[PDB]
Design a protein around this ligand. Structure first.
Ligand SMILES: C#Cc1c(F)ccc2cccc(-c3ncc4c(N5CCN(C(=O)CCO)CC5)nc(OC[C@@]56CCCN5C[C@H](F)C6)nc4c3F)c12
Ligand SMILES: Nc1nc2c(ncn2[C@@H]2O[C@H](COP(=O)(O)OP(=O)(O)O)[C@@H](O)[C@H]2O)c(=O)[nH]1
Ligand SMILES: [Mg+2]
Length: 169
């Protein structure tokens, strides 16, 4: 089948692991060990094509070695996650895009911006603000909830679609 290497990045506690496990195992996990970095795979049909998603749920220490660079560089698309009730996680997005562009050595990298925890009442990041930033980046923006599963498939499948477009260009 066709393989897609997805990488999930973003500040600690934005819901990277919860989103990944929601997509793979269809249930909400709270208090998942924040230090554990793992790859999860799933076979799915997206727009008529059988895909093998290979999803890197990033964690561990913030380290910039040639090795780590090389590892990140094998990612084909990046899910850039912030939490809508954490403004700092949103302003961290610039930094992750910067690192992704650096190791991919390109301004054109399949990416999707994700505003997670849209189930919460205490929003601090306007939907419109994230939409506009995403538009400046030239990428899709989706609001998700790993807790309720709202738009979780949308987010990941949108990234697959972006990688697919990149491959055909
Ligand atoms: C992420 C990422 C990343 C890419 F997306 C692309 C290429 C990369 C190349 C080298 C390194 C990274 C990368 N590594 C991890 C990273 C990481 N981790 C990993 C996961 N963490 C936890 O899960 C908490 C408990 O452990 C802690 C912080 N954190 C950051 O940014 C964190 C901040 C806060 C303090 C300073 N630092 C710079 C900004 F200000 C935000 N970047 C990472 C990075 F770019 C790349
Ligand atoms: N209400 C709500 N809480 C969430 C959501 N996603 C994650 N969380 C909680 O936020 C905390 C951090 O989630 P986690 O997936 O470990 O974040 P990570 O550090 O980015 O991997 C956990 O307690 C989760 O239960 C969400 O969509 N809604
Ligand atoms: Mg985690």
């Amino acid at each position: 089948m066709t393989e897609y290497k997805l990488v999930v990045v973003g500040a600690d506690g934005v819901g990277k692991s919860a989103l990944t496990i929601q997509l793979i195992q269809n249930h909400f996990v709270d208090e998942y060990d924040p230090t554990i970095e793992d790859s999860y795979r799933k076979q799915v049909v997206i727009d008529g094509e059988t895909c093998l998603l290979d999803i890197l749920d990033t964690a561990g220490q913030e380290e910039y070695s040639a090795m780590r660079d090389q590892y990140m560089r094998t990612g084909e698309g990046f899910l850039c996650v912030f939490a809508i009730n954490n403004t700092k996680s949103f302003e961290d997005i610039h930094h992750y895009r910067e690192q992704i562009k650096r190791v991919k050595d390109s301004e054109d990298v399949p990416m999707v911006l994700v505003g997670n925890k849209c189930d919460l009442p205490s929003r601090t990041v306007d939907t419109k603000q994230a939409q506009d930033l995403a538009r400046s980046y030239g990428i899709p923006f989706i609001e998700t909830s790993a807790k309720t599963r709202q738009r979780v498939e949308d987010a990941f499948y949108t990234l697959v679609r972006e990688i697919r477009q990149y491959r055909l260009k």
